Nucleic acid binder design. Structure first.
Ligand SMILES: Nc1ccn([C@H]2C[C@H](O)[C@@H](COP(=O)(O)OP(=O)(O)OP(=O)(O)O)O2)c(=O)n1
Ligand SMILES: [Ca+2]
Ligand SMILES: [Ca+2]
Ligand SMILES: [Ca+2]
Length: 341
DNA sequence: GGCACTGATCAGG
DNA sequence: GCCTTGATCAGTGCC
């Protein structure tokens, strides 16, 4: 099997440069402002000119400005990026009907039936890069290997504006030498659990007793890692379907007052139904982010679709449930809908 | 024993 | 900050 993975470079910031080419060569930081005070919010992404100096996704805007006070700080325009992304995704469908759109800026193509070997695959990857550059003036990185996991590791290694193949021999090398923390799906908490077991490379998971592994990180991740170490991971490229759609808004001030919270909750419902478009959910969850930033949620599933009127009345009941069962003040409040008809 | 369902967790974009 | 193109866990009700 041959998998080609495409990952768009510094995507949000790059779209902003395409739309305003005077930004080219300047550090650009795309921000999500929460509106609680001035410059409250977090960085969504930054282009490489900013990232070079430590301005990275997730950090506080105030922290970014301490590092690069003269960078260009732009508000996130996700609707614009989403529309640009959709156009590029339509470009990719021309190269394979087996395509898995994995997020707003990534896709997997199964090109098993389009090329014979890694040489032809590399050439097709070049063709894809040039096409997206030609039509949308966006640069991407391409990773190619025998499965989705190594195709992604390949792209990680070639970023930015690159292309890389991980052939069968290199796959065997990585199983021995790749830092296990760098395997997709292994986050800090799991990486720490593993280190405490002495596992530092995929190969190590083959010699440890399975129940030990499973007891620490769970059955699913244990099997996942072992399948990879044995060079036996194969998951097909699958069409992804949206399963939940929601909106969460930050309140001006932390509160436990129902009447205070309601106007924000109802705004989240309005925006959520807008995003639902033609989908009709049978389930609704109210989702509260506490002051200490924990997340608490309560839901309700109906044997029928939920009208916006039913969303309003049920959401208040669920929020009350949350207030009844947790005593912390709420900082953000929202809803998420799912189980579409 | 194991399926179906919930809310919490961990992950990653 | 915000979103799920999320999956999996423990706890449970149930057959
Ligand atoms: N914590 C994060 C990470 C990413 N994103 C958004 C903005 C990114 O542009 C996009 C893609 O994520 P990458 O993780 O693919 O980021 P870039 O595409 O920004 O960087 P790179 O060139 O390393 O791929 O998703 C976000 O909102 N919040
Ligand atoms: Ca990217
Ligand atoms: Ca990405
Ligand atoms: Ca990691």
């Amino acid at each position: 099997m041959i998998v080609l993975f495409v990952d768009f470079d510094y995507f949000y910031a790059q779209v902003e440069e395409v739309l305003n080419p005077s930004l080219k060569g300047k550090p650009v930081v795309v921000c999500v402002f929460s509106g609680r005070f001035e410059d409250s919010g977090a960085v969504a992404t930054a282009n490489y000119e900013a990232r070079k100096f430590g301005v990275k996704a997730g950090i506080p805007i105030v922290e970014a400005k301490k590092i690069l006070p003269n960078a260009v700080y732009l508000p996130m325009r996700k609707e614009v990026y989403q529309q640009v992304s959709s156009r590029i995704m339509n470009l990719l469908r021309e190269y394979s009907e087996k395509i898995e759109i994995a997020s707003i800026d990534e896709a997997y193509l199964d090109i098993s039936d389009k090329v014979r070997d890694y040489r032809e695959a590399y050439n097709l990857g070049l063709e894809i890069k040039n096409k997206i550059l030609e039509k949308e003036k966006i640069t991407v990185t391409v990773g190619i290997s025998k499965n989705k996991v190594f195709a992604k590791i390949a792209a990680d290694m070639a970023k930015p504006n690159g292309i890389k193949v991980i052939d069968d021999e290199e796959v065997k090398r990585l199983i021995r030498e790749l830092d296990i923390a760098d395997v997709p799906g292994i986050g800090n908490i799991t990486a720490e659990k593993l280190k405490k077991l002495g596992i530092n490379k995929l190969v190590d998971t083959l010699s440890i007793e399975f129940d030990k592994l499973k007891g620490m990180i769970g059955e699913a991740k244990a099997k996942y890692l072992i399948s990879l170490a044995r060079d036996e991971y194969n998951e097909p490229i699958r069409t992804r379907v949206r399963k939940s759609i929601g909106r969460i808004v930050t309140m001006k001030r932390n509160s436990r007052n129902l009447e205070e919270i309601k106007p924000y909750l109802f705004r989240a419902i309005e925006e959520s139904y807008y995003k639902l478009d033609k989908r009709i959910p049978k389930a609704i969850h109210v989702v509260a982010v506490t002051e200490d930033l924990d997340i608490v949620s309560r839901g309700r599933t109906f044997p029928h679709g939920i009208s916006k009127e039913t969303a309003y009345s049920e959401s208040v009941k669920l929020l009350q449930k949350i207030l009844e069962e947790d005593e912390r003040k709420i900082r953000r409040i929202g809803v998420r809908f799912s189980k579409f008809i």
